[PDB]
Amino acid sequence: EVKLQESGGGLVQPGHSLRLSCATSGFTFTDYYMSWVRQPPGKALEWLGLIRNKANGYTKEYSASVKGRFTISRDNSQSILYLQMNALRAEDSATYYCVRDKGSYGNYEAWFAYWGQGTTVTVSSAKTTPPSVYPLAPGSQTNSMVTLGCLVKGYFPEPVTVTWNSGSLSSGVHTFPAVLQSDLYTLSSSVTVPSSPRPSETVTCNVAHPASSTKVDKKIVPR
């Protein structure tokens, strides 16, 4: 199974540098070209560049918007692809993906077909801040389905991950995009479950904020 995994993404101060990583497996790294692609939130994809395979001297090609600031490299030992970003600007805030590019064969249907999950890079001078997690229980079994929620506000930066009942609850879950306001992010998440299972089994939302190494659970008690 082919796997690509980016990381290194997080909060970075304007004008500084950040190096992203992309661990791979499931294929002979050195036989393939690798590309880097980014997508700023709610915007189009942008190709940043690629690096070639052994046969082609591991040469690099770059997009015009980053030639000079960004460098692509690869550690063929550990089969890891890298992206060095210098003099970062807000426009660099986005989700970065590494992609297996062309290889030493004719498996064309496979070119640019494998992408990592992507890592979020945030370029801002704003300070980090953990989230306050608040439960959302209805005011007054009115129906057959009761909706619950979790309020995650005042954190920075993105992302945060919300799950319900350690993930055992994925159905009926809604996690709205975060909204920024005054250097602080706020987001909510709703879950719908049958009146029967609650309050009878227990619903809990789990929130994790890597940037702040925060991780908390919040039972949803009725009110």
């Binding site: 590309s35 692609v37 189009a44 994809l45 942008e46 190709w47 560049g49 690629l50 090609e61 770059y62 997009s63 015009a64 993906y97 064309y108 249907e109 070119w111 640019f112 077909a113 992408w115 990592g116 999950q117 992507g118 306050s132 608040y134 439960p135 959302l136 229980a137 209805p138 005011g139 007054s140 909706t147 929620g149 309020l151 506000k153 809604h174 709205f176 995009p177 975060a178 909204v179 306001q181 706020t186 987001l187 909510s188 709703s190 719908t192 009110r223």
Partner: protein, 213 residues
Amino acid sequence: DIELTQSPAIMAASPGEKVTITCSATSGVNYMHWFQQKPGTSPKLWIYSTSNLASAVPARFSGSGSGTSYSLTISRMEAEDAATYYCQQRSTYPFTFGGGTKLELKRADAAPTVSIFPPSSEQLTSGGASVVCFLNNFYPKDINVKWKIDGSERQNGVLNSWTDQDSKDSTYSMSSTLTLTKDEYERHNSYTCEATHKTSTSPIVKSFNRNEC
């Protein structure tokens, strides 16, 4: 430095309807590639080398063109096809992607399920008062929310959040949060969440009365 413009930038297709996405270049390319990206996921290769369908890609899909004008077509629209499509050229360095085309799938009108929640005891202990409202699983997208405290309309302090078309039922969900100081929140008695949607002549509303206990 080839730039690729796609049109339309946004579109809604009825089930079965034929769909055509065009990608135009500032210079000639030998081939055109297409990618389909669904909300919260990584892009997936869809069409490569202009007209070759990638793995798991349905036959109703096809691609064509040459020179500086290419297109992607869906003979009969299916719910599974709703997503954002992107074209790509690797004929000249640097490779580049198109502006993108956000393709939603039209469906039966659905009224939003409105849920309102008063501030948690926790937040209140902290000195803040956020009143939240969910407007879940509706369609079309066009929905308008209004907050009413004791009958009056509230504008400032209202943060909205919209999701993209859900893959499970093809609906849209919105969350509206009204943040107030504990002081302003307790200065009032009735909070309402009012949503106007094409599914109803009169607003769909939910409210709650602040109670002491």
